[PDB]
Design a protein around this ligand. Sequence first.
Ligand SMILES: [Mg+2]
Ligand SMILES: [Mg+2]
Ligand SMILES: [Mg+2]
Ligand SMILES: [Mg+2]
Ligand SMILES: [Mg+2]
Ligand SMILES: [Mg+2]
Ligand SMILES: [Mg+2]
Ligand SMILES: [Mg+2]
Ligand SMILES: [Mg+2]
Ligand SMILES: [Mg+2]
Lengths: 100, 61, 135, 149, 141, 65, 214
Amino acid sequence: QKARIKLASTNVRSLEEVANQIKQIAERTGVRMSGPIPLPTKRIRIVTRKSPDGEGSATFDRWELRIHKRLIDIEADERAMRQIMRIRVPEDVTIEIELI
Amino acid sequence: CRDMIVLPEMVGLTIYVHNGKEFVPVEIKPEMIGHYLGEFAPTRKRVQHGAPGIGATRSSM
Amino acid sequence: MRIIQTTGKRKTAIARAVIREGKGRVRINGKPVELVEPEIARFTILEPLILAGEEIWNSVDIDVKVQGGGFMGQAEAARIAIARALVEWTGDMNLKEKFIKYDRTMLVGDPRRTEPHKPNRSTKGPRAKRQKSYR
Amino acid sequence: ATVYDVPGDLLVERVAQRLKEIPEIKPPEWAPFVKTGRHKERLPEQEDWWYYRVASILRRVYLDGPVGIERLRTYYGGRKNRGHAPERFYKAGGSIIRKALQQLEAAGFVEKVPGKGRVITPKGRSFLDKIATELKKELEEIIPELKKY
Amino acid sequence: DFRHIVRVAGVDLDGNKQLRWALTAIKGVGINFATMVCRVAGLDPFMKAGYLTDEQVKKIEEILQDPVAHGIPRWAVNRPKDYETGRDLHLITAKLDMAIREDIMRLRRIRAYRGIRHELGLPVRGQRTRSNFRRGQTVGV
Amino acid sequence: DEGYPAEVIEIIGRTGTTGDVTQVKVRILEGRDKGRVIRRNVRGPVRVGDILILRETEREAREIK
Amino acid sequence: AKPLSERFFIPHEIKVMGRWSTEDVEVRDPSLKPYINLEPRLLPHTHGRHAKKHFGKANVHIVERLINKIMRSGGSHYKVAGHFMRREHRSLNSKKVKAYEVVKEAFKIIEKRTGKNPIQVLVWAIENAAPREDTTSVMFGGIRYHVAVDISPMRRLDVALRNIALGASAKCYRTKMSFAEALAEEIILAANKDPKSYAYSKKLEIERIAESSR
RNA sequence: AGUCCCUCCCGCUCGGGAGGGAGGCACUCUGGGGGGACUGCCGGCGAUAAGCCGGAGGAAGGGGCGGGCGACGGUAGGUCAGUAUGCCCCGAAACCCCCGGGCUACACGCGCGCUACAAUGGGCGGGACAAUGGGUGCCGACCCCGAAAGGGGGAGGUAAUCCCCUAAACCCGCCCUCAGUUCGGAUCGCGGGCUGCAACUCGCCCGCGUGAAGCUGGAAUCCCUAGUACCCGCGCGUCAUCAUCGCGC
Ligand SMILES: [Mg+2]
Ligand SMILES: [Mg+2]
Ligand SMILES: [Mg+2]
Ligand SMILES: [Mg+2]
Ligand SMILES: [Mg+2]
Ligand SMILES: [Mg+2]
Ligand SMILES: [Mg+2]
Ligand SMILES: [Mg+2]
Ligand SMILES: [Mg+2]
Ligand SMILES: [Mg+2]
């Protein structure tokens, strides 16, 4: 009777906007929602040699990509379920919903 | 086929194994059972060193 | 039924201590503090209690849970937590004054951490480098 | 008194001495000729190392059960000298630990939890705790501070 | 009783050493194999070698004659699966030396790669030879 | 045979080939010339109030700028 | 071997290693008096928080100074008694526990052999091993000459400790004597002005060279 | 952690421990927002300016500490064998495939390292404490077989959930006692395995045996200012198999 929502994006602000929209949807209805839980960030780190050839001193680049995550639990209410089913997320945010 | 294993039924024959540029003759003896053919066809020539040339020592450069 | 909790940190070691009224029993991860080895580690934990005195020592029971770091790092974190718990429990500033004179770090902690490594012989350290040759 | 109240090595010594009275604990037939792991170099020197190993395994199961063969193998590994190459860590073998656990189960000291490993039975818990209590009674004669615990 | 010199299997053993370490003077016997034979014979490996009796020496030599028949595992002997008879054997001193020489001679007769490497006095098990393995004198330019 | 103690009262400046020596003014505390103020050369870190043990008290270092 | 009363030792008073009190130890030399710290303290391990500030080593207990001094290899890039001593991977670098044990056993031996407080003997030794005059080098015409100068007290203390440690290290290198015994022997010899002490002989040589070049 | 319930141990239980279930967000942690340090306060030097030196309080004091970002130009410095591209050449071979060799040779000179030359140790038994990262062509707990390397089944995991994952240096007890040795483990013999279409040239692992030089290093010369240097192991990259390497912990 509860739904679990997982959010992930490479931009923090869009994630915050989507979470706030879900929070307000839950607020405008009588329904209990466990707050957005922040899960640990994913860091993808790649270290590469800079020069194309092998002459000279060795210097390195450290490229990094960060992926943020959030977790939200809400109880399945059809009046509130339709609203979150129709909210539109930006193209740089991934959302997945499941019933437990 | 340099990686063929010598078998007992091969004893008594003569086989020419490629060594990179030519086929060398091998006469199979009974004590060769269990070895690869390539073990009897060397691929490199023995080394007989000449006089060290310019750049072989610190003072020769 | 007073219960007081305190925390201590030392280079990736974390210690959480609970102090209450008791008979004088102190345990580190369940082991009596008198059986802690080696000796240099045991003396690190016992200093705040010895400074406090025998009367205070025999009137309280302390239980400490510590994780992370090494055997010397865990001893110091437990020492910090025990000192903070002692000063907060009895709440007298004469004891607090005595601790600062003997060792300031007992109450303020140690903020040192490892420095990240850099290229040119990265595995050895941030500043160690490969031997240089010219010919 | 419990296991947590005494030093580990002294308790292992006492338990090893006591375990020789149990008819179900017997070294296997290949015991005289083997090393205790690929990282070792020479055979064990004590003529009764089997009982020491069994006692150590029993105390290990008491504290960290349920636990299986692989984790115990990790526990009994160590550093190996590799000639001209740098030293490295390696695990231990499997036959010794498996045989010891089977003998302990036959003696009624441990039991098997499916999919999880082996845990200590009440009989074995009493067996260890009684020896620990005796050792602590002896120990506090020379360390008066242990009477509080 | 105590003897400062004891001869076993044609080798004179120190009497002040422990038996396990004393027996290692025999070529073909290491520390592990010595401990095995000591345990099989029913002798404390830590006893002095100088307290041995004649019957014990006879027993030890008999064990060294055919260890497998006396309960030593087949994976512990120094020549398992013999090339001629096919049995599991343990060899010591002159017989060991002549067996090794015979193996190398067999490799040499069939003109195998390892035989040539043995003949030329060069590394046999695939080492690099450009940098190390240098034994000689500097050549000038 | 035991030297004479002196007390540093003023620091003048660094000197020496590699800046390893400091020039100081000291006051003799004991002996024939007790109370006199003379300048000396010292090797090692030093501050006002330290006490030196002079083996003799008749040599005076040349003034530096 | 070691009695259980010693393996599990519980102190109850603030004293050095819980075994020796420094209440009656006196320093005769007026120059070294303010630089030999003798405040009461149980565990001599300050975790190296003093090296940051200038003159910070003044307020560090002398026993910890000795422990840090012997926590080394000994002969890395100059010869001691005619030999390099490169311990390498079997040295006492960063192993402060082993150095602690070595110093403790050395103190036990010292107290047993002489019947006095070990800290007092150590103080006497460092007093006897500290030089009072040194020299600096000048270059003229491609030749190196010496000029005599004076030594500040802190450098005196540092040199004394280093020489004691070096002598102890040299006495136990590839011999049958152990490190603790060598340290005790070196301290005892230096306390009695015996010429067989490495530190005392080094001090005599330094002072002679400085004197002969005023 | 405090509170409740059930079960099991001990000195027989006044007391003291361990699991499990309810229950909670206290503490740790995770991640968004915010505060905090400014030569702001005090005393000197300097000019009364710019600043400098020394103290108080403070988690932190004077670019707070560690990184990223390298101006106009030069070096005919390296790279057309990463990719793009002018000219010149081959254009039925200098283009495209397949099999076998080589880059791994070896009187010798040199760079960077690993292991040692032993007691500031070697061996055997026992006792302690991590972090960074990675996993579906994969990580694999748990059970069984084998002395070891390994073999046969196989839960859970698309992961703060399951796994790699109970590190070593360190501590306790016994043997060895200054010796080319119970130091060192190069070199070689016999046997057992794994990856792979293929292991001889030319792979890695295990058992027994064998036991080289080396007893501290000339003239010269390198790195490093604090959680730094020294000592100790681990993760990832490369990768079917293979780490004395690079980058990190
Ligand atoms: Mg580091
Ligand atoms: Mg272990
Ligand atoms: Mg080693
Ligand atoms: Mg150019
Ligand atoms: Mg050019
Ligand atoms: Mg090449
Ligand atoms: Mg080339
Ligand atoms: Mg050895
Ligand atoms: Mg091959
Ligand atoms: Mg030697």
